Amino acid sequence: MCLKLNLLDHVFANPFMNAAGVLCSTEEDLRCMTASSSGALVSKSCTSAPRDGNPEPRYMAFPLGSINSMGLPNLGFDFYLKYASDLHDYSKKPLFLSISGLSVEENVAMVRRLAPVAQEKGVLLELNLSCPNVPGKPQVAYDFEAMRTYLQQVSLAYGLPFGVKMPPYFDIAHFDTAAAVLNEFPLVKFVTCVNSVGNGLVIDAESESVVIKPKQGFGGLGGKYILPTALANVNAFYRRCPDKLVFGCGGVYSGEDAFLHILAGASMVQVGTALQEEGPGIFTRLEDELLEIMARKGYRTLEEFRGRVKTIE
């Protein structure tokens, strides 16, 4: 019985990794994620220049999930590039690098610089088109024209295999259009579904107040709230992008939740809110719990059930 995978020219001990933004901002965070049982890690989305992000409180967690408006905060591209070039131990596990420039120009600027590092070291790009917390800069992937431009320019500037972090969609016509944009770009080898469900609002009944400070309390939702949305987007792109990989993200707290993502079509399974709450010990739990489900069902590998969710009649 076995959780191993072999994809994008890398070997993964298991399908689990952090979700971008969780436990991956500093060198310390990145070492911790490397020392953990995860199959891979991804760095914090970065802009070209370092940034502070939004005023605190900007993240809060509850029994059913999390709300966040982290905004810009990252140590900057130079730092994440050096991590990938000089510091990351690739013998431990594969590394993905998330970028989220504020203009197509900014992204292209960065991906020009990442390419030689990608060629040399094997770092994998994840391009973030779905941040819901920068004011005056809505989720790029909700503007399909903008999306096609970003992907053109980045494919052209980078010229190597990469993936895209997508926002959730809620409408069958949007699934159809978005997968079709993506399928114009053969260098898009993976699609990560989903980023936070944007612009929710948590209100505390006792205080009568919002619980995060930026944007009058509005922020992206993670965790239990979003699992059926995440599974929908995972399967919707799995069905519509038969030449690409789908990475699942959203609502994973258990090996059962990972099992569902995998049934829906996920290759790698990312863990945001639950990892933020539980810490990196979650990875050993998720592995054991997923193996227990596989054992009970007689499944010996991931590809025996990946994408094999059953429909009714």
In the numeric block, the tokens 């059926």 are attached to 228
Q: Does residue 145 belong to the site contacting a copy of itself (CB under 8 A)? A: no
Phi and psi (nearest 5°) for 152?
-60, -55
32 part of the active site: no
Instruction: Please tell me the distance from the alpha carbon of residue 80 to that of residue 226, in angstroms, as a whole number.
Output: 29
Kindly tell me which residue out of 39, 94, 168, 250 binds ligand FMN, with binding defined by CB under 6 A. 250
Q: Is the CB of residue 88 less than 8 Å from the CB of residue 34?
A: yes
Q: Does residue 249 belong to the site contacting ligand FMN (CB under 6 A)? A: yes
Q: Is the CB of residue 280 less than 8 Å from the CB of residue 39?
A: no
Bridge partners of residue 46, in order along the sequence = 99
Contacts of 4-11 with CB under 8 Å at 24 or more apart are: 5/39, 5/267, 5/268, 5/302, 7/245, 7/267, 7/268, 8/124, 8/161, 8/189, 8/190, 8/245, 9/122, 10/40, 10/94, 10/122, 10/124, 11/94
Identify residue 287 by its one-letter amino acid code: E
71 annotated ligand binder:
yes
Q: How many CB atoms lie within 10 A of CB 207?
A: 8
Beta strands 65-68 and 218-222 are antiparallel
Kindly tell me which residue out of 47, 48, 107, 195 binds ligand FMN, with binding defined by CB under 6 A. 195
207 interface partner picked from ligand 5LM, a copy of itself, ligand FMN, none, CB below 5 to 8 A per type: a copy of itself
46 interface partner picked from a copy of itself, ligand FMN, ligand 5LM, none, CB below 5 to 8 A per type: ligand 5LM
Q: Is the CB of residue 140 less than 8 Å from the CB of residue 147?
A: yes
Catalytic residue among 24, 32, 46, 131: 131
Phi and psi (nearest 5°) for 59?
-145, 140
Q: Does residue 210 belong to the site contacting a copy of itself (CB under 8 A)? A: yes
Q: Does residue 193 belong to the site contacting a copy of itself (CB under 8 A)? A: no
Q: How far is the CB of 313 from a copy of itself (least distance, A)?
A: 6
Q: Does residue 71 belong to the site contacting ligand FMN (CB under 6 A)? A: no
209 annotated ligand binder:
no
249 interface partner picked from ligand FMN, a copy of itself, ligand 5LM, none, CB below 5 to 8 A per type: ligand FMN
Residues near ligand FMN (CB under 6 A), total? 27
Which residues contribute to the site for a copy of itself (CB under 8 A)?
55, 57, 64, 67, 132, 135, 138-139, 142, 167-175, 197-203, 205, 207-210, 212-213, 215-218, 221, 224-226, 228-229, 231-232, 235-236, 239, 256, 259-260, 263-264, 293, 305, 308-313
Which residues contribute to the site for ligand FMN (CB under 6 A)?
19-22, 44-45, 59, 66, 68, 70, 98, 128, 165, 195-196, 222-223, 226, 249-252, 271-274, 276
Residues designated as active site: 131
Binding-site residues for FMN, please? 20, 44-45, 128, 165, 194, 223, 250-251, 272-273
